[PDB]
């Protein structure tokens, strides 16, 4: 906490973010000195496309519930770790290359986490484990080559998961086993050659899946599970136009539909 009144711009050294705070507080200048009681009044921050390089100071905003920081130049989110009241965190289009272990462990009220269009290469084991109220996780347009074993296991409330436009080489065995509420799963535009046997079997609520634009390896017998699953659930598979398209999972090399192959 801030113990003595202090200029907005000292607490929030990034010029653009200090201006966000000033406007939210209805203060007249970023040189105005502010109190912790004033900072306690902030219930959300909506600062998309604002050239923000740093959110240093945000740690003094304990009551922030909705945080939208899309389209800035953020490379560190250390300062968010204490924002225990956060329910929506939108970090689209920043320059995060990693998530330090633990960064989200106190964010237990989070319902939606949007990490689209960052440069995340990998995730630490258990990074999402405390996000037990999470319903929407969006990791699309990152650089992920793998997922940790068990990374979604604690996210039993998850209803949408978007992994599209990464470079996933494989999925861990069992990775979706706890996701019994998941309705919408996007895996399109990755580098998947295969999925684990049974990988969709616990997805009792699944209504929509995207599998297109992966270089599926249709060699037998490896492809049997996927081919069988698509045929059994053909109405669930969608293309990029959003239409029902079970043939949109294609064999790399032959180009024919995965679901046409009988081992
Ligand atoms: Mg929802």
TrEMBL record:
<protein>
    <submittedName>
        <fullName>Variable lymphocyte receptor B</fullName>
    </submittedName>
</protein>
<feature type="disulfide bond">
    <location>
        <begin position="220"/>
        <end position="263"/>
    </location>
</feature>
<feature type="disulfide bond">
    <location>
        <begin position="218"/>
        <end position="251"/>
    </location>
</feature>
């Amino acid at each position: 906490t801030i113990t003595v009144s202090t200029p907005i711009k000292q607490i929030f050294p990034d010029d653009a973010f200090a201006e966000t705070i000033k406007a939210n507080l209805k203060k007249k200048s970023v040189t105005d000195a502010v109190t912790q009681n004033e900072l306690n009044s902030i219930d959300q921050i909506i600062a998309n496309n604002s050239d923000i390089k740093s959110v240093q100071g945000i740690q003094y905003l304990p009551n922030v519930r909705y945080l939208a920081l899309g389209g800035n130049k953020l490379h560190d989110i250390s300062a968010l770790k204490e924002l225990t009241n956060l329910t929506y965190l939108i970090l689209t289009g920043n320059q995060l290359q990693s998530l330090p272990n633990g960064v989200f462990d106190k964010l237990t009220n989070l319902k939606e986490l949007v990490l689209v269009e960052n440069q995340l290469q990998s995730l630490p084991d258990g990074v999402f484990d405390k996000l037990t109220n999470l319903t929407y996780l969006n990791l699309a347009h990152n650089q992920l080559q793998s997922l940790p074993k068990g990374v979604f296991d604690k996210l039993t409330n998850l209803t949408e998961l978007d992994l599209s436009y990464n470079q996933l080489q494989s999925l861990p065995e069992g990775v979706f086993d706890k996701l019994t509420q998941l309705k919408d799963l996007r895996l399109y535009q990755n580098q998947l050659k295969s999925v684990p046997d049974g990988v969709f079997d616990r997805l009792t609520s699944l209504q929509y899946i995207w599998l297109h634009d992966n270089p599926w390896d249709c060699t037998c017998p490896g492809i049997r599970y996927l081919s069988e699953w698509i045929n059994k659930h053909s109405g669930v598979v969608r293309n990029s136009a959003g239409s029902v398209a079970p043939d949109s999972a294609k064999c790399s090399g032959s180009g024919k539909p995965v679901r046409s192959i009988i081992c």
